[PDB]
């Protein structure tokens, strides 16, 4: 997109898997996008907002979605380092 005139000429921008950086196809029905709800500091209560990950169908078909999702959770901060 974004020809020399500068305007973004593209009818939609596809997502990328947050584990393998691959394009999520329009017909990749295996692909998931899921949200993890973080808690607050004191009472461990759901504080409204949340953080989301996208896993491509190929990654979550070879069986590496489990390892990937937890691995993102460390980076964002949801899962403790001592895991």
């Amino acid at each position: 997109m974004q020809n020399d005139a500068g305007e973004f000429v593209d009818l939609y921008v596809p997502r990328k898997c947050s584990a393998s950086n691959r394009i999520i196809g329009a017909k990749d029905h295996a692909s998931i996008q899921m949200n993890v709800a973080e808690v607050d500091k004191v009472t461990g209560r759901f504080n409204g907002q949340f953080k989301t990950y996208a896993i491509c169908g190929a990654i979550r078909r070879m069986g590496e979605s489990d390892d990937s999702i937890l691995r993102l959770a460390k980076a964002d901060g949801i899962v403790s380092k001592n895991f």
């Binding site: 584990a19 393998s20 950086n21 691959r22 190929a58 990654i59 070879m62 590496e64």
Partner: protein
């Protein structure tokens, strides 16, 4: 036996990128490999790489960023002039917008756009996009 060390390193990181590995280890390092990995980094196609130094031909660990598609090699290092470079460009590169052809010239190892910028041909090494 192993005859093209660069060809083996390129195939290894291509297979690892297809599988989705975060890191790949290429066993035989060489000067041409490091320069070829350097041009990919400066164009952002791969992440950091570290050369593990043993007293033999060292090993290299590359951080794959997942934004690569193909990093093949042109094993017979054909001599490419500045007049037939575009015929290699459209034969190998997926399009004129992106994709890079790496050739070793007398000014060093670099991509086709820069090789043409300083007006020098050379020997074809490989390509990546």
């Amino acid at each position: 036996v192993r005859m093209n060390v660069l060809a083996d390193a390129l195939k290894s990181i291509n297979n690892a990128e297809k599988r989705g590995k975060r890191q790949v280890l290429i066993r035989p390092c060489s000067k041409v490999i490091v320069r070829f990995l350097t041009v990919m980094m400066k164009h952002g196609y791969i992440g950091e790489f570290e050369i593990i130094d043993d007293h033999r031909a060292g090993k290299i660990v590359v951080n794959l960023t997942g934004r690569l598609n193909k990093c093949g090699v042109i094993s017979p290092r054909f001599d490419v002039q500045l007049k037939d470079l575009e015929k290699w460009q459209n034969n190998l590169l997926p399009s004129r917008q992106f994709g890079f052809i790496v050739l070793t010239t007398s000014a060093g190892i670099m991509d086709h756009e820069e090789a043409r910028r300083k007006h020098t041909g050379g020997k074809i090494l490989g390509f990546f996009f």
